[PDB]
């Protein structure tokens, strides 16, 4: 081509913890503080 109930927040909590939101800034806060 050119281009159901299962809802919870444990899964975000289980595999998206304390390391993503600031990940880009923390590695490379050089000259863009």
């Amino acid at each position: 081509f050119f281009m159901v109930r299962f809802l919870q927040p444990f899964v975000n909590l289980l595999s998206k913890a304390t390391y993503w939101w600031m990940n880009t800034l923390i590695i490379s806060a050089h000259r863009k503080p």
């Binding site: 913890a17 304390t18 939101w21 600031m22 990940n23 800034l25 923390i26 806060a29 503080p33």
Partner: protein, 193 residues
């Protein structure tokens, strides 16, 4: 600091002192003396104890088990890099915190300071509209600073877990005597933290 700081500035001309601001000089006399009396010594003592203990535990676990000497090359080097990363990142974040709280408290200094001048100036309710941004404008930075510290711990935590697996393999590999394996495993668990 006390004998030297006073000694340096007593013998000088009034022109420069009345040309550069007084506030910075007062700060140099007060805040920095507080920091060096109160802050630098305990920080240095704590840092030296922690660094030396981490080095000692790593050294113990490497002596007690020969494979550790090869095994210990990559991980600590990566930790070195990560250390430098935080060694700047949060520094910048602390700077951000250092200023983020300057205006907002002064605003609550203002609205209160205008005890009656803004009481019935018909602009009272619109005042909340702007106020409700500053609070967020500060707590947002607060969470970011907290998050930087958290990220370091998480990275550190996973690094620590890797060391334990290595030591465990080494211990079953070592099997020299119960005393050796016990000391090695316990010190790895100590260095974890």
């Amino acid at each position: 600091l006390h004998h030297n700081l006073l000694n340096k500035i007593i013998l000088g001309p009034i022109r420069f002192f009345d040309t550069t601001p007084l506030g910075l000089i007062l700060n140099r006399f007060s805040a920095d003396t507080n920091i060096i009396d109160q802050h630098i010594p305990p920080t240095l003592e704590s840092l030296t104890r922690s660094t030396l203990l981490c080095l000692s535990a790593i050294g113990m676990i490497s002596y007690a088990t020969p494979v550790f000497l090869i095994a210990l090359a990559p991980l600590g080097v990566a930790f070195y890099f990560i250390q430098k990363y935080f060694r700047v990142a949060s520094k910048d974040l602390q700077e951000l915190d250092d200023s983020t709280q300057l205006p907002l408290l002064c605003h609550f200094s203002e609205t209160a300071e205008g005890l009656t001048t803004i009481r019935a100036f018909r602009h009272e309710t619109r005042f909340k509209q702007r106020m409700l941004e500053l609070t967020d404008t500060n707590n947002i930075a607060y969470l970011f600073l907290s998050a930087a510290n958290r990220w370091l711990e998480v990275r550190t935590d996973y690094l620590g877990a890797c060391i334990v697996l290595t030591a465990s393999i080494a211990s079953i590999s070592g099997s020299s005597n119960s005393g050796l394996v016990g000391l090695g495993l316990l010190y790895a668990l100590t260095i974890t933290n």
